[PDB]
Amino acid sequence: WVIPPISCPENEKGEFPKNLVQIKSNRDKETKVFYSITGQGADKPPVGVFIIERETGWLKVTQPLDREAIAKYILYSHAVSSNGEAVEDPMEIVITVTDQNDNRPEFTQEVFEGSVAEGAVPGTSVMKVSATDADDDVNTYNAAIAYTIVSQDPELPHKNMFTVNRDTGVISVLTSGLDRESYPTYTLVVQAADLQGEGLSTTAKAVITVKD
Ligand SMILES: [Ca+2]
Ligand SMILES: [Ca+2]
Ligand SMILES: [Ca+2]
Secondary structure, three states, X not given: OOOOOEEOOOOOOOOOXXXXXXXXXXXXXXXXXXXXXXXXXXXXXXXXOEEEOOOOOEEEEOOOXXXXXXXXXEEEEEEEEOOOEEOOOOXXXXXXXXXXXXXXXXXXXXXXXXXXXXXXXXXXXXXXXXXXXXXXXXXXXXXXXXXXXXXXXXXXXXXXXXXXXXXXXXXXXXXXXXXXXXXOOOEEEEEEEHHHHOOOEEEEEEEXXXXX
C-alpha cells in the first residue's frame, strides 16, 4: 500500500490555521525531536502560509489559497534533536490546491469584427467569437465555456439571423435574408458562460458586415 498525496481546497474559511497531516520519526522515544519545514509557502515567499507544530509535527495551513496563484506547493520537512542534529533525512511533502469557480470567463476581446456575404447559404460560417477561463479546466467543468447570442440588432429581416456553436463559438448564417442593401452591418451580443452555460458569465459584441 502507499501514502496518498495532499490537496487542500482553495478559498477556505472556517478558522485558521488548520491541520493537514501528521509527521513522525522513530527517535520519538530515543531522544527529543523538533520538526520544521522548508520551501515557498513555508519558509519562503509566500512566507509561512504553512506551519508545523515543532512538537507534534502536525502540518498546517494558516490561511486560504489560490489555485490560480499556485495550484501545487512543494514542501520539505526536517527532524532535529534538541541539541541540533538532523536525525532524519529531509523528507518531501506535496500540497495540492483543488479548485473552485471564481473566475468570470473572459472573451479575448470586446469587439470581434466579422464579415458575411449576401449570397450566403444557411450554414455558412461567418466568424468566431472566443474566450478564456482560468479555473481548473482540466479536472472540473469550472472552465467549461458555452456560448450563445443574446441580442441581435437590427432584428430584421428576422429575429435570429445568425447562430453560434456553443462548444466553439463560431457564428454561421441561420436563415436567409441578409440583404446588404438595407441592413449593411449587424451587431451581435455574444455571451460566454462557463460551467457549460450554468455559472459565471461575460459579454462582447460582434459586427457582421454583410457583403455583396
Ligand atoms: Ca482563486
Ligand atoms: Ca469560472
Ligand atoms: Ca479557480
